[PDB]
């Protein structure tokens, strides 16, 4: 419940995604990384990205 989210943006910056371009080009990219599995809810993972994008 919003806490853990910033972890993924953090991961998401760690690998400098594009939080706007695609969810997965960024996430299928962070995929194999144990950090995509920080949260077992994939339905939350991509919601992360959108907040962090302009967070």
Method used experimentally: NMR
Q: Domain residues for 14?
A: 1-55
CB 49 within 8 A of CB 12: yes
Instruction: Please give the tally of structural domains in the chain.
Output: 1
Cα separation, 16 vs 2, whole angstroms: 21
Cα separation, 43 vs 35, whole angstroms: 15
Cα separation, 26 vs 49, whole angstroms: 9
* 34: CB partners within 8 A, 6+ apart: none
CB 35 within 8 A of CB 11: yes
User: Domain holding 2: CATH number?
Assistant: 1.10.10.440
């Amino acid at each position: 419940d919003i806490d853990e989210r910033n972890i993924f943006f953090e991961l998401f910056d760690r690998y400098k995604l594009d939080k706007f371009s695609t969810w997965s080009l960024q996430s299928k990219k962070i995929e194999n990384d144990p950090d995509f599995y920080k949260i077992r809810d994939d339905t939350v993972r991509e919601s992360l990205f959108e907040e962090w994008c302009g967070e």
